């Protein structure tokens, strides 16, 4: 029953090959709903979910203008960061920003976040109280000083506690069919010999939504986490997710092993067995 | 919807 709205922004410099590439996407929970791509022909914020399509021209004009303004600020940032870190003109670097809000089952504000990274590492982030900053290194302290003097946190908090929550509610209502659903995983296990003395047991979960899921193997009830290969939860492309976990076991001991599946769409966690 | 223009670093 819990929900989130998140926007993700990536800018990558390509010195001597034009302006930095900028890509923005927005999600409600695990469902994408908007994008903008600086390299694309339209130069517009575009719909990526059916239920955002009904937003009118003021929404699309306004979101296009704001996202282009985010893109320009990251263009400035790439220059600034290269000065803060004394980096050379020619190498490619990456700025990432993510922000948004979480609400619970009752749709009231739970938490807010606004985080920045440079070259794949934490740079600066709003703390939980939305009033202060965590700066990860000395260059990010320079940004903290500038953002404190400019009262950046207060303006962000007003968004994250207010507007962000208000628009997440609206999307959850307009997209109710898509966003307020739970699709429980279809589960099974497969068994294949790898030789005459060992077998792979692979526990599968298919067609589920949302993406959060836990799959674990037990041997006589003991978790086998060091011996489990757990793949990243992956999209099926139809709005649902898949995942698997596998162990390689001595032939004959299958009945000692069980797979355990937890997902919010299940009335109870499932235990799958070889007997 | 997005927030307003971010302040530069």
């Amino acid at each position: 029953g819990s929900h989130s709205m998140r926007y993700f922004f990536t800018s990558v410099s390509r010195p001597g090959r034009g302006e930095p590439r900028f890509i923005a996407v927005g999600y409600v929970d695990d469902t994408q709903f908007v994008r903008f791509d600086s390299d694309a022909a339209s130069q517009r914020m575009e719909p990526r979910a059916p239920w955002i399509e009904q937003e009118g021209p003021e929404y699309w004009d306004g979101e296009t203008r704001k996202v282009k303004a985010h893109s320009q600020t990251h263009r400035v940032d790439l220059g600034t960061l290269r000065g803060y870190y004394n980096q050379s003109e020619a190498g490619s670097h990456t700025v990432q920003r993510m922000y948004g809000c979480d609400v619970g089952s009752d749709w009231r504000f739970l938490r807010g976040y606004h985080q920045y990274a440079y070259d794949g590492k934490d740079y600066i982030a709003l703390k939980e109280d939305l009033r202060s900053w965590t700066a990860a290194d000395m260059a990010a302290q320079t940004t903290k000083h500038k953002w404190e003097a400019a009262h950046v946190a207060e303006q962000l908090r007003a968004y994250l506690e207010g507007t962000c929550v208000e628009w997440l509610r609206r999307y959850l209502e307009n997209g109710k069919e898509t966003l307020q659903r739970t699709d429980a995983p279809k589960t099974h296990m497969t068994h294949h010999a790898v030789s005459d003395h060992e077998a792979t047991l692979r526990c599968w979960a298919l067609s589920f939504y949302p993406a959060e899921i836990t799959l674990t193997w037990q041997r006589d009830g003991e978790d086998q986490t060091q011996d489990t290969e757990l793949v990243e939860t992956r999209p099926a492309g139809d709005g649902t997710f898949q995942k698997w976990a596998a162990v390689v076991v001595p032939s004959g001991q299958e009945q000692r092993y069980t797979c355990h599946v937890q997902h919010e769409g299940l009335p109870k966690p499932l235990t799958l067995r070889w007997e | 919807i997005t927030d307003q223009v971010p302040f530069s670093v």
């Binding site: 990536t10 890509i23 791509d37 990456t94 990432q96 070259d119 992956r234 | -």
Partner: protein, 100 residues
């Protein structure tokens, strides 16, 4: 600079059945930086009609992308995904295995 290797998974959207249309996915996740080359291959040749998702990233900042194309599996046709990234010394080919 941080570099993180792509975790590559090649799979179909629905359980494969020869003669039934389906989608072939290559999901690449966990990588950094974002520059990446991903091709779907049919009998070792590049498939042309390939779409991909919009670049996004996880809680740990690492990127993920889905590459996909509609396809109809047969007995004889072999599918794979070929990926190049700065963390890979040569392009890596992961074959589609429908019996997982």
């Amino acid at each position: 600079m941080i570099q993180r290797t792509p975790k590559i998974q090649v799979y179909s959207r629905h359980p494969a059945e020869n003669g039934k249309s389906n989608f072939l996915n290559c999901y690449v996740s966990g990588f950094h930086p974002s520059d990446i080359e991903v091709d779907l291959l049919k009998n070792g040749e590049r498939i042309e009609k390939v779409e991909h998702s919009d670049l996004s990233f996880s809680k740990d900042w690492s990127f993920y992308l889905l590459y996909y194309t509609e396809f109809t599996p047969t007995e004889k046709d072999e599918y794979a995904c070929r990926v190049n990234h700065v963390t890979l010394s040569q392009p890596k080919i992961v074959k589609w295995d429908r019996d997982m």
